[PDB]
């Protein structure tokens, strides 16, 4: 199914991002980078196209792929307030380029969105156009993607993926549970950060990694009942997240979920607000997609065949907010620690994923190294 192929490609890209940022917060969208690279597939030909299709494990034009992706997209948006999620996938191409006959309508038919034509030779004008598109399709939250001097007059093609997420848990953490608690960073140092607390019957599994280390894995359902956040931290303090990160897949997360049972626990979880901008060039080149970035090697002749053309920039920017209101009657019941004899404290670095549970689609994933 496309959901697993799209997710696992995006997870392989995340692994490239994480290894370059091993001791810093990262939030990333596996689904997002797969969705926009699938769009780029339609613009490419020759070796450039083959490199993308190889890395992704499928071809957007093969029988059933594009509609399956439309259903996936139309499905991941549903169970949300307008204030809770917002995504955009966009290809921007120089406006005076003659495009291949029939490309624009075939693109629109496949993805139900349009390639955007912009005049990159008017650099500030073009930067404002891209920035406003991203702003108005991320609920205003990704409001300044490209800074002054980030667009070049010789730019001809830009890819952007931007996502904002602030979903509310099925049981929100109670506001009166807010407190400060020590968080132990990977380098051995500590920092006191705001945390919240909630007792619940949490879906939980203890997972043993191939290297023999125990992980606490916990599910936090979102109010729509279709998305959940999975939290995974080692039981032992000085176990790096990298080892588990480098075997992650949509099926492994489904394996965790299948082994979970609901257990009574007091969960203490930091508040966190993460913001990551990923220059996708190096991670994509590491996965074999080199030609698309090379001015004379790139083949974009399905989009335009009479002018040379390559990707000047490929960016993902993601903003996620966790534990930041609901009605007083709809937050959790506050339960003091005296009433809760079993607890899990997330006071050390952890992995998280936001998952579409009916499909297993990995919408977001990241590491919290310092809240």
């Amino acid at each position, epitope marked *: 199914y496309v959901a697993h192929l799209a997710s696992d490609f995006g997870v392989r890209v995340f692994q490239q991002v994480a290894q370059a940022s091993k001791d810093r917060n990262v939030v990333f969208s596996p689904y997002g980078v797969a969705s926009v690279l699938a769009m780029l597939q339609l613009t490419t030909g020759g070796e450039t196209q083959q490199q993308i299709q190889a890395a992704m494990g499928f071809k957007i034009d093969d029988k059933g792929m594009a509609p399956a992706l439309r259903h996936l997209y139309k499905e991941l948006m549903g169970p949300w307030n307008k204030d809770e999620i917002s995504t955009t996938d966009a290809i921007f191409v120089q406006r005076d380029l003659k495009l291949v006959q029939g490309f624009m309508p075939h693109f629109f038919r496949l993805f139900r969105s349009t390639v955007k034509q912009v005049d990159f030779s008017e650099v500030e004008r073009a930067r404002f156009i891209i920035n406003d598109w991203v702003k108005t399709h991320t609920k205003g939250m990704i409001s300044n993607l490209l800074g002054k001097g980030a667009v070049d007059q010789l730019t001809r093609l830009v890819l952007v993926n931007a996502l904002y997420f602030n979903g509310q848990f099925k*049981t929100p953490f109670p506001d009166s549970s807010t407190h400060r608690r020590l968080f132990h960073k990977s380098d051995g140092s500590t920092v006191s950060v705001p945390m919240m607390a909630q*007792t619940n*019957k949490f879906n939980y599994t203890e997972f043993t990694t191939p290297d023999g280390h125990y992980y606490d894995i916990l599910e936090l359902p979102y109010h729509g009942d279709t998305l959940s956040m999975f939290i995974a931290a080692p039981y032992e303090k000085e176990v790096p997240l990298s080892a588990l990160t480098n075997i992650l897949s949509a099926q492994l997360i489904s394996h965790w979920k299948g082994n979970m049972t609901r257990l009574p626990r007091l969960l203490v979880l930091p508040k966190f607000s993460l913001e990551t901008e990923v220059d996708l060039r190096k991670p994509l080149e590491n996965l074999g997609m080199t030609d698309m970035f090379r001015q004379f090697q790139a083949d974009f002749t399905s989009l335009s065949d009479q002018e040379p053309l390559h990707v000047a920039q490929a960016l993902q920017k993601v903003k996620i907010e966790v534990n930041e209101t609901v009605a*007083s009657s709809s937050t959790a019941v506050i*339960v*003091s620690a*005296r*009433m809760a004899p079993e607890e899990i404290i997330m006071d050390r670095p952890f992995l998280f994923v936001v998952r579409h549970n009916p499909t297993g689609t990995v919408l977001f994933m990241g590491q919290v190294m310092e809240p």
Partner: nanobody
Amino acid sequence: QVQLVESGGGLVQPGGSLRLSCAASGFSLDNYAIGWFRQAPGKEREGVSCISSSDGSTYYTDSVEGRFTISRDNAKNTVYLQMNSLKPDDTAVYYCAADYGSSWCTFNGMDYWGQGTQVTVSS
């Protein structure tokens, strides 16, 4: 359907006592963890007391320890919450909660919640 119903609420003056009761018509509570939580006007709900389904263990929130006693009447399929030395701050709607086979009360995520009964402590 298991439907918890609370009774025994009322108005008392500071220092007095009430005995709340929780029952579900047609069902024995002896195999449920049974708890009480409360909600004062404008505030978030807070857990107050709990009795295990498995052992004798009981649990009490800090502000009621030594004043409240949760206990079972198995003949009546009932759980009582004895509230002594009531203070104005104990004014709230009090709710019963039940969770099959559990050793303590999470309140959130428990199988069943009652609809509440008013307790008012005032001169």
